[PDB]
Design a protein around this ligand. Sequence first.
Ligand SMILES: CCCCCCCCCCCCCCCCCC(=O)OC[C@H](COP(=O)(O)OCCN)OC(=O)CCCCCCCCCCCCCCCCC
Ligand SMILES: NC(=O)C1=CN([C@@H]2O[C@H](COP(=O)(O)OP(=O)(O)OC[C@H]3O[C@@H](n4cnc5c(N)ncnc54)[C@H](OP(=O)(O)O)[C@@H]3O)[C@@H](O)[C@H]2O)C=CC1
Ligand code: SF4
Ligand code: SF4
Ligand code: SF4
Ligand code: SF4
Ligand code: SF4
Ligand SMILES: [K+]
Ligand SMILES: [Zn+2]
Lengths: 176, 208, 340, 156, 291, 48, 114, 95, 43, 360, 41
Amino acid sequence: TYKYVNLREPSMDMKSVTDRAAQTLLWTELIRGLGMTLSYLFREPATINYPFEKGPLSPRFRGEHALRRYPSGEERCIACKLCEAVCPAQAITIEAEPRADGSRRTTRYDIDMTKCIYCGFCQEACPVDAIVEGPNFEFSTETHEELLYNKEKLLNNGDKWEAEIAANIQADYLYR
Amino acid sequence: TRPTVRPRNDVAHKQLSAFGEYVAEILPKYVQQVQVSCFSELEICIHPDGVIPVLTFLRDHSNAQFKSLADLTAVDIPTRQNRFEIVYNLLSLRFNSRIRVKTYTDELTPVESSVSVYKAANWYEREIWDMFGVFFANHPDLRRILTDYGFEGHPFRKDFPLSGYVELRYDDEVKRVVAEPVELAQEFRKFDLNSPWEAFPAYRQPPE
Amino acid sequence: LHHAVIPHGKGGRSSVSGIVATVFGATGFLGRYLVNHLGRMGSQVIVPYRCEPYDTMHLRPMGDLGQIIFMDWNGRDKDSIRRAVEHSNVVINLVGREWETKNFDFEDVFVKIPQAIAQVSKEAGVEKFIHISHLNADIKSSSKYLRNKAVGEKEVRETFPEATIIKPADIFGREDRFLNYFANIRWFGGVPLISLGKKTVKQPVYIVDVTKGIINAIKDPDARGKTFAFVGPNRYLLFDLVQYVFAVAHRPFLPYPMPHFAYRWIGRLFEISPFEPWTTRDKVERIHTTDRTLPHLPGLEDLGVQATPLELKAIEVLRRHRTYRWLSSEIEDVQPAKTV
Amino acid sequence: SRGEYVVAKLDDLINWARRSSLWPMTFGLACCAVEMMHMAAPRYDMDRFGVVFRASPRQSDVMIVAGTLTNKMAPALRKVYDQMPEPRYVVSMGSCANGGGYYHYSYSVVRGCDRIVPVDIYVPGCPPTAEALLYGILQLQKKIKREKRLRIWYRR
Amino acid sequence: GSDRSRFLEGKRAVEDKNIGPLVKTIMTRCIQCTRCIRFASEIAGVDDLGTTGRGNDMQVGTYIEKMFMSELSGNIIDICPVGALTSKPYAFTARPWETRKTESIDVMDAVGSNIVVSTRTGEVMRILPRMHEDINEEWISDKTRFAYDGLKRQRLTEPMVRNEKGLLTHTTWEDALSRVAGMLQSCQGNDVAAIAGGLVDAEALIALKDLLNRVDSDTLCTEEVFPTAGAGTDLRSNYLLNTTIAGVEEADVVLLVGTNPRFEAPLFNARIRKSWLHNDLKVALIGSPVD
Amino acid sequence: PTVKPPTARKFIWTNHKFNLSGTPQQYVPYSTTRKKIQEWVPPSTPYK
Amino acid sequence: TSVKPIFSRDMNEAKRRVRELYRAWYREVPNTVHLFQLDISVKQGRDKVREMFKKNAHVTDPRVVDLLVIKGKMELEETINVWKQRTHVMRFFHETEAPRPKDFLSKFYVGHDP
Amino acid sequence: GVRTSPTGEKVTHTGQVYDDEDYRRVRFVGRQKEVNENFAIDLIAEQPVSQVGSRVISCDGGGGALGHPRVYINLDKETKTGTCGYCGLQFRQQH
Amino acid sequence: VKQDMPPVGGYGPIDYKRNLPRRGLSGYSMFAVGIGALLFGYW
Amino acid sequence: EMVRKCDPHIGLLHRGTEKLIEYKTYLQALPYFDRLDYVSMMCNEQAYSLAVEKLLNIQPPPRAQWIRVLFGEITRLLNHIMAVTTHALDIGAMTPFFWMFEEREKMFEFYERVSGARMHAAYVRPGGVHQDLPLGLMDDIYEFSKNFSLRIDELEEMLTNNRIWRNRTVDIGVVTAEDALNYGFSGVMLRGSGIQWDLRKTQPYDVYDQVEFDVPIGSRGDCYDRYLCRVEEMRQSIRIISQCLNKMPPGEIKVDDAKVSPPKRAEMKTSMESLIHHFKLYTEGYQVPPGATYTAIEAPKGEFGVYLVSDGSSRPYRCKIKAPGFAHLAGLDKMSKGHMLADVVAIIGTQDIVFGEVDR
Amino acid sequence: TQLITVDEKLDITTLTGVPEEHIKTRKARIFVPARNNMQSG
Ligand SMILES: CCCCCCCCCCCCCCCCCC(=O)OC[C@H](COP(=O)(O)OCCN)OC(=O)CCCCCCCCCCCCCCCCC
Ligand SMILES: NC(=O)C1=CN([C@@H]2O[C@H](COP(=O)(O)OP(=O)(O)OC[C@H]3O[C@@H](n4cnc5c(N)ncnc54)[C@H](OP(=O)(O)O)[C@@H]3O)[C@@H](O)[C@H]2O)C=CC1
Ligand code: SF4
Ligand code: SF4
Ligand code: SF4
Ligand code: SF4
Ligand code: SF4
Ligand SMILES: [K+]
Ligand SMILES: [Zn+2]
């Protein structure tokens, strides 16, 4: 159930000794290595053409966060603070009060995108699928505070990417 | 109890109880308690004067043969007067087993270094100097190994806070990365999560 | 006072200072250390920049998030100034050019732009304005710099009646043009002077002292409308000053007199390039101008600043110019220069 | 004017020369070094963009701070950045280098590498994928493309 | 309990009520434990909560549109083990794991109820009682529970002085303390005096007493006019509740003269009622015939 | 989406925007909550 | 009250070890100013070392001053071997920190600190 | 349903807009205050009241496992409709 | 149930060993080629 | 150039992991372990999962254990590609680096399909695994393992027979067996030095006593025998992936003790007890019985161990992390004596040192 | 004898690395935590 790597006693007959001396003088394994390199010279390379092509992904991908909505216009977030409770980086800050129709909604929903570790506990802790971690990963910014999303940027990302996040959750929610 | 509950290994429990009685009745000078956990692991709680004479037994004895030092660990507990709980974990490759040797100290009592028995601890208890402040006499290069060079204090003591007492920022005045008192932009929000209902009745502590 | 501008915290980086500063000319030498010293109190600093944004990059590590706001501005543009200073409560003016260019003379930089900034800061409701003039600025000087800067001094004083005018005497530092000018005439031919430079008297003031003076001028309500004269504690001749410069850097030193026959013409001999000028005739007329003594004005003693002299920081400045053979030297090797 | 067009084309040439052959330095710290090596790997392939490693800080342009910035390597990072010739750029890769990350409240973590060096392009993630890092590098090229160095010099 | 369900039917939906602007009532969540009724009958003594219905439709309600307004009517927010009775000012605003529980003292009445101000990120969220056997057993009045949001309106924040017109405007502490001490240094005798309020601790009172003893001014007064005739305040036994609050549980006859202890000191009335209930106390009230 | 079109809503954007960094359309963070402590405003009448 | 010592039996040998550590730092300070090419003087450095020694001047516990000797030897070994940098030596000279309030009136003015 | 302050700044659905003398509008000078313009309280008013004929109605937000957890609403109040606790929809017993 | 499972007949066997094809001539053949090249060059 | 003293100063990446674990609950403190050894993510998840499940006195379902072993061997392929290719990169052969990172890119696509993120999955949780395999994943894992053995073959064609490689690894850092046991070496550092020890064979965890594989044992204890041991562990990992894809059992992927693993979101929105358990697992978390375990597994670097002390509450009281690279980098001081500057780089290559878990 | 006599006050304020500002201006509070009246445990 175990094997001995490098426990080969080489043969000491004049045929194999002449073969190893020919390997030493005439460099057989060097030509073998150069031949393997030459065999990779004549292949199709695996360089995809970004940004006109895109790297392959899955519908489970963890990218930019967003707050979704029902198919009636109402925002899903009912201010229940599970997403900031299970947040391992404590990137989420939630401050809530009843709004003008008495419904339990947030007033501050901040996800610090530089504390956030993109592990997706908030998309699985949210009982109403309000916060989701959508498809976008090309949201690099030139300044640090543009990576401190408030509620407004997350609702705008939800309105931006809803046409994709709805199909991804539609394809994926049977596993969850 | 068939799908989800862990299968109990009574063989390991009986063999570790026999070997715990063995190590107890050989060394009554240093071995204080011998316990076997419910998940079949052995713990030999000893006195800090027996760091070398216990381990040198377990490194050498023909029915111990714990040749490997897997992990040396200190656990700080503030409510005890001997607050540091230094934990030796030993692996015997021939007897296919592990033992745990648990000693104790406060901040000022030195614990004897075990580099003469296992050289592997040459960093580990050295780390216990850096992370806890437990001094290990007769150690060759005992100095800090994980913290920064200008770090005053010992981090993994539980009276040391989560964020430190200094932060580093670059400063263009003196053209230098300097240390200033920390002011967190967001406070570390501590969550009082301990539910007041008794989760495990078999671990109940009897009252005063 | 407004609830967001109430000073909080222990005065560190993430504290709130109660200071909203608009630092014009912040991408130079004084604005560098001024944004550095304001950002460690947590002051919301508006930085108007004219240059490339890359040249402003070294201002970004000087504060917390959102405590430095960069924005474009032009000097002949009232709209940019009113767009930049309307939310502040102190406007510091550090706009200066040691040399005139094709698009800006000294009249644009010292008379037009400070009067525009002070006029807008009056007519937009700013409580504190701070202007920076030179100590030798006079109406009838032989240099264009000091004449235009004294005229701009009088204009800023008369159009904003509480403008804290500050007179630093001669500032030395790391990115200066005072010790870096005296040390970077070494391989040109022998440090030219007039009558061996023993005829003009200076007192150099240190830049951290000037910056702490600007901070204490922002803090002090008693410092409204004054005309401060920031000077160093020790007065020097120019000759033994340049002795001390070439004696800290451990350099050869053979000065020579270059008279007024041809040492104003080495300007038009030595700025034939249109680039950043090494010398000019205004630099010649200002280095060979003595520092006037104005004891009646309040100085660094009258804002709670201990003035740090030359000898404790000249090694920090001029370690850059030693070749290799005395980089492992000390401050206890060079004898300090003679005061006057 | 005419010379305005001359310095405009000169800015176009030198900004193209600087954004077309950015040379990153071999600087990784943590998990993001693996994904930066994936951004060098034959799928996403930085080297097609003229983006090739030089280990010396003297001969590099962009410093991808890929990992976590502790206290013990803050002056090392500052001296490495100071030993890069101007123009030099900084891409902050990953959440720990951006704003403290998963170890933001720790006792020995510098909360973001913008406290130490000036940072141009923040690439968020934990780790950002090699495609996202490549997006940050191409956004850095779009940032270098709209520089106006000689135009501002002619207009100063 | 078990970790999953066997129920596959349609649940019940119990109608909400309206019992006041303090106790938000969502009766779907009730479990019919009847702590409402036992509290409102035995301790609060109001007798306005009951069970209407028989079987699974047994609704803990009032059967009328009555507004349950007692002096202790918020304490059903404490002892309801489910979320059927919530605190309407505290409703939707916080969540208990993040609350920093800081132990403190009520000042709204003279009972001095041991409380916990539980906060969140440096802002007061709610006020709970502490279980303390001699004072406030585990109850508080409604003023104690719901007066935290008067603590965040119309607050004084900055020093304010009269300008040349006679209007109060903001100023620093140097200017304000200079303009107070410049008048203070020109006073002596009874030319300076002090009125104390209702919510001021002993440290500030003794600080201002020593300050006016630097001037030799003994005229320092309170809002509440206690008679200084006789022993006055000299012996302590003529202005205290000399027995205890717990000593009400040892008495048999309690005389109340001119007071309304329901509203002046509500948990003292709750202790009087507990002695009335369990000890068969006799109470006589010389004063107005109040409920 | 030419074969399986996405499901339409009233709130999804009719104009997808690219990354708006560096432009005047760049995101600015701010507090989305109102003022907590109501400060006392003095009556502006004379006090006699 | 009978506990195991570290290196010193009583206060006399502990004072001897503190004294030899101060000897080592007094010898060390000119080398630290020289090879790190600092901007400080030997007078200023030795007065700061005097301040660092007098910061712990209230201890009569022999084990505590033994551990202070050992940690001073660690600082010394991190200074002789160039393991500290310029910044780790200049962290003792708190130069970038603003001057903190000391009296009652300024601490009253700036915040709620006792 | 966004309205505009007298200062010149948009109003969120929370109700936050800065003062005229608050300095923190200077972060919006030269940039834009990214607010949402699909207000949820104005989009939930366009939903008609669902006329149902039961006494206890079961609302789950639609979709089955993609909505909120399924709750039960009593509808015996005829003056007030039965508002769902999560989704903001509302029902009515038609008799 | 519909779940990620292996197919009906399982999977095919997977090679996990070394395969170095033993190419090239013998030693005598390589020295014969080299010495013949020497002799032709010399002639 | 003859090196007389190697002092490896560490702590340049010490980010205080095992103090931050003491303030965060068990689900919250899982993704720290992905970030310790950042090429052996799910193996560290598996070690912490076995520690928490040993304290909780529960066990995973069978399908979750087979998924853990399958992705543990995919992670072993990741770590040994990283080890071989960076040990060749630190010498100068930078070509099989670029060859094998296409295969490692495909395995990160497998992680991106099975969990969503490419490196730090947060997948292997205490109670089994978090999410069941997507449809069509095992077909791609079979189509990957059908092609990866040729990649191992051509890598061994390049570097094993090459004399320039053998001159850099034959007599470099010989480790004697008794001093290997003395210095706390574990895993490959033992097995290259002739010591027969593999924690999947001797102290077996979840289903390694059902899959059949071989243990590569060296003969001289140099860099070269450990190179051959890593190549052969890639061979045996292909063997174990074949045996796991042929023997994947149906069923669930979490433990059905719903007080430990969260319920399905389909029944979280339908049942009451499932919503209460979802709420209290994602806000408080689950309580753990009080006690101290040291669960140690065979990460591809060696013994990766968690000494977890649980006070009874839903947060760990102590979580000590034993890394293999810590004791290996301790043994660096003996291993580099008698060699030069260009051999210390090869010794740091043959001990696969990821400093995130060396520093914690 | 290997045991020394220490009758001095057991003080480690110079060994925990804590600055002086967080020793002589901080008020530690030892208390049994009161029961949350929402709950019965
Ligand atoms: C009086 C009249 C003259 C005035 C002074 C003129 C001085 C020289 C000017 C040279 C050209 C300057 C303009 C440079 C390009 C400006 C336009 C531009 O932005 O083009 C971009 C385009 C590539 O676009 P990009 O975004 O990089 O592509 C991403 C992939 N889609 O880029 C391209 O398609 C290629 C750009 C090539 C640039 C020209 C070729 C290099 C320069 C050769 C001459 C100078 C060389 C001197 C000697 C060097 C050593 C041989
Ligand atoms: N000799 C001295 O050092 C002393 C100087 N002062 C005064 O203090 C001030 C600061 O001095 P210092 O830091 O040394 O000078 P600098 O040359 O170092 O910096 C001046 C700054 O002003 C800006 N500026 C100047 N003119 C214009 C313009 N027309 N349009 C836009 N920006 C402009 C420059 O920006 P950009 O790069 O975009 O042009 C630069 O950032 C000056 O006003 C100076 O006269 C006072 C006493 C002594
Ligand atoms: S992905 Fe993780 S770290 Fe990020 S906000 Fe969600 S729970 Fe927090
Ligand atoms: S995002 Fe979800 S989990 Fe977070 S508070 Fe809103 S509804 Fe609750
Ligand atoms: S941001 Fe996260 S994943 Fe990235 S290097 Fe840091 S710890 Fe690793
Ligand atoms: S106390 Fe709560 S659970 Fe009990 S009867 Fe009242 S509403 Fe129902
Ligand atoms: S938190 Fe308690 S009262 Fe509220 S819905 Fe859940 S079980 Fe019912
Ligand atoms: K309740
Ligand atoms: Zn609903």
